[PDB]
Design a protein around this ligand. Structure first.
Ligand SMILES: CC[C@@H](C)n1ncn(-c2ccc(N3CCN(c4ccc(OC[C@H]5CO[C@](Cn6cncn6)(c6ccc(Cl)cc6Cl)O5)cc4)CC3)cc2)c1=O
Ligand code: HEM
Length: 527
């Protein structure tokens, strides 16, 4: 009876007097044992979705999920159906696949889930404080409104010639091309596209000064800042190491430069309508009267530029890679250019961009096959019951949604792993609210998010960058197509995606060989 409790205390005491060898081994064994025990008991619960079994505690299914998340999702879906959890480096991720999954996560009430609690630890160090995910959602909603205010049809009309100019400059000056000197060459598209993207997006969103500053050793700070933008930071945001310091330094130095330009313009009253900076200078007052600081303005510009950097660089990379084994498509895109721009005797404008459906379909189809963000997350804040199920997702869990996975299902996109731009005949718009709409603070967007095609997400956290992305990728590709033909080195094909990077970029080196359609044509201007 009571002799039992004595031997508990005795057994407790003999424990701590075990040989240290057996002691260190014990400290490994019993959480291992317990984990299996706990998993097995968890399986009983009918108000929890299935949990993918894992051996190593805490680590969970991290390695298999990290390397091939869609193959992992496919497997889990065969066995368990569309709702299932899995452990990932100390967190419980509840996946919900398919259009119902989109509905569950993207249209989750503000009360139930938090994007900032899922994302802030990565982004805040990189972008800086007070903006995006380092603030309440209603602040974010309004920051998105402010940014959108520089992303208008008239802005795109003026961006097009500037982006065009940057792309031509790059063909002229970059070692990777130099078209006034070489008629053919080889490039790594994972070198060329990040540079082309930063050059074109700096010039148009940030302006001529911030573009100019890229022709200096200031450019090294973007590289530094970029290295804090990696998934590692989702779990180790701050570690006393050098690249964590090069990041912190870069955020300060880059934001300082933007603040310098901003304060400079206010000084001379040079606030026009040129770029996103001008725009945020005129329009960054919240509905409660608080103005964003010059520091928050600058931090937001870093965020925006960083966001648009990696998604677009990735996509232009993939477009080049898919087109390299598809001279039929290159030929077809080339004809559309000849028709819409009168054999090239018409200058590219934003309006004419809208009359190039095949081009835009190519972007659309590349966005389907290569969603740059394979997993979007939220942290669960209030217990969530899953509709038409017994399941309840408790606070402290995370939900994971993956439209990119659905993009690659034959059920919704017949022959989903074939690149086919003609599957978007009669549907070349970047996206569009198929029905009723809703405004979270940054404009009216689709109310339903059940579309199997969701390259830009949906709900309150929806992308506001899609028309800029289409504008930028569209001018870029229009010119690539008109200027060059390109193909793979012998025996090379489309590389598989890297799923461990921030975006699903191509696995390197991803090389193509280009050649000038007109070996004799020259790009003017000085260099
Ligand atoms: C350790 C073992 C190894 C095998 N392993 N184990 C696990 N993993 C792993 C897991 C998951 C992932 N990732 C990939 C990246 N991913 C992700 C990245 C960015 C992201 O961004 C969401 C928010 C914040 O950033 C932006 C991105 N963006 C959207 N449009 C443009 N960019 C964002 C929004 C707004 C602004 Cl202003 C800027 C930015 Cl960057 O949206 C969401 C998910 C999460 C899963 C990678 C590796 C591994 O590598
Ligand atoms: C091909 C290009 C891009 C794709 C496919 C893409 C995709 C996405 C997706 C899926 C989301 C939602 C994330 C989530 O719900 O967790 C998102 C959010 C967002 N993106 Fe993009 N993006 C692209 C480019 C851009 C560009 C160019 C900009 C700015 C110019 C931008 C700015 C933003 C912003 C401000 C948000 C809101 C984040 C939030 O509300 O939490 N993106 N994007």
């Amino acid at each position: 009876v009571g002799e039992a409790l004595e031997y508990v205390n005795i057994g407790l005491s003999h424990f701590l007097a075990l040989p240290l060898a057996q002691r260190i081994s014990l400290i490994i064994i019993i959480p291992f044992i317990y984990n299996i025990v706990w998993q097995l008991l968890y399986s009983l619960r009918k108000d929890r979705p299935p949990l993918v079994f894992y051996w190593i505690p805490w680590v969970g299914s991290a390695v298999v999920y990290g390397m091939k998340p869609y193959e992992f999702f496919e497997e889990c879906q065969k066995k368990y159906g569309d709702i299932f959890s899995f452990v990932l480096l100390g967190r419980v991720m509840t996946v919900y696949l398919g259009p119902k999954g989109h509905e569950f996560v993207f249209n989750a009430k503000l009360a139930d889930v938090s994007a900032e609690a899922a994302y802030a630890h990565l982004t805040t160090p990189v972008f800086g404080k007070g903006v995006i995910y380092d603030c309440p959602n209603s602040r974010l909603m309004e920051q998105k409104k402010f940014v959108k205010g520089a992303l208008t049809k008239e802005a795109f009309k003026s961006y097009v010639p500037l982006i065009a100019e940057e792309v031509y400059k790059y063909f002229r000056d970059s070692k990777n091309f130099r078209l006034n000197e070489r008629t053919t060459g080889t490039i790594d598209v994972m070198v060329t596209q990040p540079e082309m993207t930063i050059f074109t997006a700096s010039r148009s969103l940030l302006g001529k000064e911030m573009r100019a500053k890229l022709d200096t050793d200031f450019a090294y700070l973007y590289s530094d800042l970029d290295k804090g933008f990696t998934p590692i930071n989702f779990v180790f945001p701050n570690l006393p190491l050098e690249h964590y310091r090069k990041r912190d330094h870069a955020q300060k130095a880059i934001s300082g430069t933007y603040m310098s330009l901003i304060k400079e313009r206010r000084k001379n009253n040079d606030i026009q309508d040129r770029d996103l900076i001008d725009s945020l200078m005129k329009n960054s007052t919240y509905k409660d009267g608080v103005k964003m600081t010059d520091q928050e303005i600058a931090n937001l510009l870093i965020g925006v530029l960083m966001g648009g950097q990696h998604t677009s660089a990735a996509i232009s990379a993939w477009i080049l890679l898919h087109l390299a084994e598809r001279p039929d498509v290159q030929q077809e895109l080339y004809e559309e250019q000849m028709r819409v721009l009168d054999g090239g005797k018409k200058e590219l404008t934003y309006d004419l961009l809208q009359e190039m459906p095949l081009l835009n379909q190519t972007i659309k189809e590349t966005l389907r096959m290569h969603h740059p963000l394979h997993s979007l997350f939220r942290k669960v804040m209030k217990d969530m019951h899953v509709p038409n199920t017994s399941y309840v997702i408790p606070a402290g869990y995370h939900v994971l949604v993956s439209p990119g996975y659905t993009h690659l299902r034959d059920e919704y996109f017949p022959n989903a792993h074939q690149f086919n731009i003609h599957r978007w005949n009669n549907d070349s718009a970047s996206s569009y609210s198929v029905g009723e709409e809703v405004d979270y603070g940054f404009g009216a967007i689709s109310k339903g998010v059940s579309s199997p095609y969701l390259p830009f997400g949906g709900g309150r956290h929806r992308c506001i960058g899609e028309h800029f992305a289409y504008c930028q990728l569209g001018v870029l590709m229009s010119i690539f197509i008109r200027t060059l033909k390109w193909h793979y080195p012998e025996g090379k094909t489309v590389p598989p995606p890297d799923f461990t990077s921030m975006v699903t970029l191509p696995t390197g080196p991803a090389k193509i060989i280009w050649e000038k359609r007109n070996p004799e044509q020259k790009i003017g201007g000085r260099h």
